[PDB]
């Protein structure tokens, strides 16, 4: 596979590679102060934050390459300046004896190195979850966002990335122009490493949503089924027939609350998000 390059496509190349990667999802805050709202909520956050911390060693990665690609490019301009003057000296008739070949292989070391990825420790629910009052968790509950508008746009935001990263992927997918060879051939193979790396981290984002959605949705349901804030203010202004009802209604209201916050601990259980590293290229043959 004979070797040929176009200088400016590994420019073009270079630069594709360094292509600004759109910023990525804001923050988010608690729907309210439960135990487990708090709990699949750090999980939440604690995996966001992951995938942050990777997409900035990918960042690092597509610079790596450009890097490397430049390198080469350097590679092939002094030979072709050796191929020129080799040509010059022939025709002139020169007969100084002709140099001997050396073969080549790019200059990586000034190429920084894979970016770090910090360790974040992953939050852990607690056993089991506290008993609660059912006022005082009516009131944990609706003394918060009791739509979790928040979580929800979090949510939003981490699903519409998916698409960011998957299109950011494809700066990297196409091998340069004009460009043949070992060097070329290893380099397009980073390439398409990094490039289908940045796809799954798009469907890493979607999984991330899905966790979301899956919370959100379960936070609906909560304040759904668990006894409202007006619950309690009904539970004191009504006129009851006896002291006896009174308390059935206690009973049953408190049995809501547990129902719901139980049906709230499991349904809102979601799974740590794992990103993979991303590749990091080495260097080119030649």
């Known amino acids: 596979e004979e070797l040929q390059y176009e200088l400016p496509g590994l420019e073009r190349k270079a630069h594709e590679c360094e292509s600004t990667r759109p910023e990525g999802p804001g923050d988010a805050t608690k729907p309210d102060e439960l135990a487990t709202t708090a709990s699949v909520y750090s999980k939440l956050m604690a995996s966001a934050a992951k995938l942050k911390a990777t997409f900035a060693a990918g960042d690092r990665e597509g610079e790596r390459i450009a890097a490397a690609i430049r390198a080469a490019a350097g590679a092939y301009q002094k030979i072709e300046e050796q191929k020129a003057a080799e040509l010059s000296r022939q025709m002139n008739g020169s007969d100084a004896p002709p140099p001997a070949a050396e073969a080549v292989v790019p200059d990586m070391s000034g190429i920084p190195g894979p970016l770090a990825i910090p360790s974040m420790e992953y939050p852990s629910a607690a056993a089991a979850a ?19 508008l928040s979580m929800k746009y979090f949510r939003d935001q981490w699903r519409d990335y998916q698409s960011t990263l998957e299109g950011h992927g494809r700066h990297f997918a196409n091998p340069a122009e004009g460009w043949a060879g070992a060097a070329a051939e290893t380099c397009a193979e980073a390439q398409r490493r990094l490039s289908t790396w940045w796809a799954d981290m798009g469907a890493e984002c979607g999984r991330l949503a899905q966790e979301a959605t899956t919370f959100v949705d379960a936070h609906d349901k909560l304040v759904a089924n668990h006894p409202t804030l007006e619950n309690v203010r009904e539970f004191e202004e009504t006129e009851w027939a006896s002291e006896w009802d009174r308390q059935n209604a206690w009973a049953m209201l408190q049995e809501q609350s547990e129902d719901a916050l139980e049906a709230y601990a499991n349904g809102s259980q979601i799974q740590e998000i794992r990103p993979g590293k991303p590749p ?7």
């Open 130 to 148: 506290d008993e609660m009052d059912w006022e005082a968790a009516a009131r944990i509950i609706h003394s918060g966002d009791t739509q979790a």
């Open 280 to 286: 990091s290229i080495g260097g080119l043959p030649i």
